[PDB]
Amino acid sequence: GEYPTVNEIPVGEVRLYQIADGVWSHIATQSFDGAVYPSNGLIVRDGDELLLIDTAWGAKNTAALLAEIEKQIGLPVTRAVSTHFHDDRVGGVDVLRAAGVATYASPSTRRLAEAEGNEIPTHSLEGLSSSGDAVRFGPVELFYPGAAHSTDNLVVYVPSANVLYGGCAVHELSSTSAGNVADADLAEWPTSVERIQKHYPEAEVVIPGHGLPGGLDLLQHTANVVKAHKN
Ligand SMILES: CC(C)c1cccc2c(-c3ccc(CS(C)(=O)=O)c(C#N)c3)c(C(=O)O)[nH]c12
Ligand SMILES: [Zn+2]
Ligand SMILES: [Zn+2]
């Protein structure tokens, strides 16, 4: 019942967590540079199909994700969106693509993934290139808030449930640092978070890219930890 944490999930196993009717997060763990990290994605019911947001950070984790979805939900994943180019978002796209899932990302994300040597979603999402842009994609809205954790980061809103999936632009409340900032724009990040706050004032659940969901306070907390990391 509690939201599952990094030491509770062996690398290679995937958990699902019911967020709202027709909305789950997925949680998996992965090793990177000799440390183990949890990470989140989203699953949104789309009639008798499912929309997936982000991989489970790796090929075997993503295969395990598909198996867990089949076990717990039993509807086919037909489309996936990756919310930026890092491996916790796109690692596993090749698995998805071999399992019949149509994979999508912005053109920015696709370029960055290619240049990084990461797996590359098949389809480009136009209409998201300027901050404040929004497009519909099945049962969600995709929103580009501006550069933050990465220049390409997208956020996802589930209007039926008022669920805001911030991805790696949003940190959990326990965070003390701004995470992996190698590709971040620390100066623009608080402005991008303000755009999220202004666009989604009715959000009831906010899900970070890593760690525990909460409410709207995750947004201000994120701005705070980013400003303090820069400063
Ligand atoms: C480039 C990708 C694949 C990657 C690799 C390894 C770690 C990360 C982290 C991360 C997340 C949360 C935390 C704890 S925190 C908020 O308290 O710093 C930490 C730490 N330490 C790292 C992120 C991220 O920030 O999106 N991406 C990562
Ligand atoms: Zn990232
Ligand atoms: Zn991340």
Side-chain angles (χ1 to χ4, degrees):
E2 232 50 50
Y3 198 84
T5 70
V6 68
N7 292 290
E8 289 163 356
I9 307 176
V11 181
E13 298 195 6
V14 175
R15 306 302 187 260
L16 309 185
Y17 184 90
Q18 188 87 251
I19 294 288
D21 177 43
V23 185
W24 302 253
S25 63
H26 65 82
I27 313 86
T29 59
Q30 190 53 271
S31 176
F32 179 94
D33 285 26
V36 176
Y37 302 91
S39 79
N40 298 317
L42 206 71
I43 304 158
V44 186
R45 196 171 51 230
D46 178 19
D48 47 24
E49 301 177 2
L50 300 172
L51 173 63
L52 182 64
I53 312 298
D54 293 323
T55 70
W57 197 352
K60 292 172 74 177
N61 279 354
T62 300
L65 169 64
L66 294 174
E68 192 70 16
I69 290 173
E70 178 56 23
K71 172 166 171 192
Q72 291 313 332
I73 305 173
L75 295 171
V77 178
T78 55
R79 297 183 292 185
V81 172
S82 295
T83 61
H84 67 279
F85 73 101
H86 288 157
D87 195 51
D88 58 323
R89 309 294 127 195
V90 298
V93 151
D94 289 354
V95 161
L96 295 176
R97 175 157 51 233
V101 180
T103 60
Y104 295 80
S106 74
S108 184
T109 297
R110 297 180 69 261
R111 290 190 306 267
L112 293 166
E114 186 181 358
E116 199 72 5
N118 288 352
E119 292 156 54
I120 310 159
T122 296
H123 300 286
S124 290
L125 297 167
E126 293 306 321
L128 290 166
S129 66
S130 293
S131 63
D133 267 2
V135 302
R136 296 300 313 273
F137 197 93
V140 309
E141 183 172 62
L142 305 179
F143 179 72
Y144 175 53
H149 167 80
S150 67
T151 58
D152 61 322
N153 52 205
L154 300 180
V155 307
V156 180
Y157 193 70
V158 189
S160 73
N162 296 299
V163 173
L164 178 61
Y165 176 84
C168 309
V170 175
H171 281 288
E172 74 175 322
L173 290 175
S174 64
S175 56
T176 66
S177 85
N180 187 337
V181 295
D183 297 316
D185 184 334
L186 292 172
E188 200 51 44
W189 196 338
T191 302
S192 298
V193 161
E194 282 156 21
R195 296 198 181 83
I196 299 169
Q197 292 173 308
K198 169 182 70 234
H199 213 252
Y200 298 112
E202 278 79 62
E204 298 176 19
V205 180
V206 180
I207 303 168
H210 307 262
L212 308 182
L216 275 164
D217 282 16
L218 276 67
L219 302 180
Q220 187 60 45
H221 179 66
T222 297
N224 290 344
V225 304
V226 165
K227 286 144 162 164
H229 180 296
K230 202 185 76 150
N231 288 346

